[PDB]
Design a protein around this nucleic acid. Structure first.
Length: 278
DNA sequence: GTACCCGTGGA
DNA sequence: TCCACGGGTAC
């Protein structure tokens, strides 16, 4: 009954800090911790002017704004806003104190879900319209554990097509054992699947899938060896704990908000930030 | 008519 | 075949 042919492009925010993460992530945190608490007006100027010193003088304001709202704001959840006052988030405060970067992204993986409050309301509607609800990273880990238990190795393409771009999987309809069995079957029929969209480049189809795996790698839970995806068994204790929630519905219920309203539409993005950043 | 979305291109 | 600037787009 599990049919991977039903595909759905479910994206996360495009990354901007993978290359120089060891500088940018401390930069993000230290900038936020220093200038906050403060109103939104002061935050915009103070953040960008301090950040421009790291990214460069030739950096456009739009790029600086994008770093602030997409990465430090939404994807990493390093701050939040309450009554026009921007505070450093709980994840930032912990990172400031222990400097634990794997635990920073381990927390990101444990709480990341579909749908979420990172997307525009436009894309959120399509997420909720397709009855999408999943904790993908617990699911990814459980799939990897099941793969090893069946003596097979998964690639990035296997993860892409059969999990992170599979509609039924993203709806929480499919058990990981069903996915693995389907993969073993396709291989016996000499079938290799890939995520590709006609008239689009690899970035459109794969960048958000690769980068999702990147953060799982930064959490030190897996390793990307060429084209293969392997668990870090030195962190097996954390792998098994997180993997438990593969069949658990998202802890943040995005199916209780009316997006025809503006009361819920405003609280939706506020409540997500509270859940994700704290 | 901002703010994530994503085309584009260096690497 | 990553990865991120900054224009593209719909709140």
């Amino acid at each position: 009954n599990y049919n991977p042919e039903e595909q759905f492009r479910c994206t996360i925010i495009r990354g901007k800090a993978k290359n120089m993460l060891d500088n940018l992530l401390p930069a993000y945190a230290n900038i936020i911790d220093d200038i906050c608490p403060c109103d939104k007006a002061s935050f915009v100027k103070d953040f960008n002017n301090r950040l421009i010193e790291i990214l460069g003088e030739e950096t456009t304001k739009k790029t600086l704004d994008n770093h602030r709202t997409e990465i430090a704001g939404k994807l990493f959840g390093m701050f939040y806003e309450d009554d026009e006052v921007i505070f450093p988030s709980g994840r930032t405060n912990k990172y400031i104190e222990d400097s634990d970067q794997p635990a920073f992204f381990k927390d990101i993986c444990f709480k990341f879900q579909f749908p979420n409050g990172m997307d525009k309301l436009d894309k959120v509607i399509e997420k909720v319209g397709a009855k999408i609800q999943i904790r993908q990273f617990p699911y990814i880990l459980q799939v990897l554990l099941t793969a090893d238990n069946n003596n097979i190795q998964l690639s990035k393409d296997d993860i892409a097509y059969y999990v992170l771009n599979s509609l039924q999987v993203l709806q929480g309809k499919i058990k990981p054992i069903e996915v693995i069995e389907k993969i073993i079957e396709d291989r016996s029929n000499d079938i290799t699947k890939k995520v590709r969209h006609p008239g689009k480049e690899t970035s459109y189809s794969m960048q958000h899938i690769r980068e999702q795996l990147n953060y799982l790698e930064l959490a030190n839970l897996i390793r990307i060896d060429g084209n293969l995806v392997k668990l870090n068994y030195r962190e097996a204790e954390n792998i098994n704990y997180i993997a438990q929630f593969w069949g658990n519905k998202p802890e943040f219920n995005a199916y209780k908000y009316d997006f025809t309203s503006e009361d819920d539409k405003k609280s939706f993005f506020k409540d997500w930030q509270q859940y994700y950043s704290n």
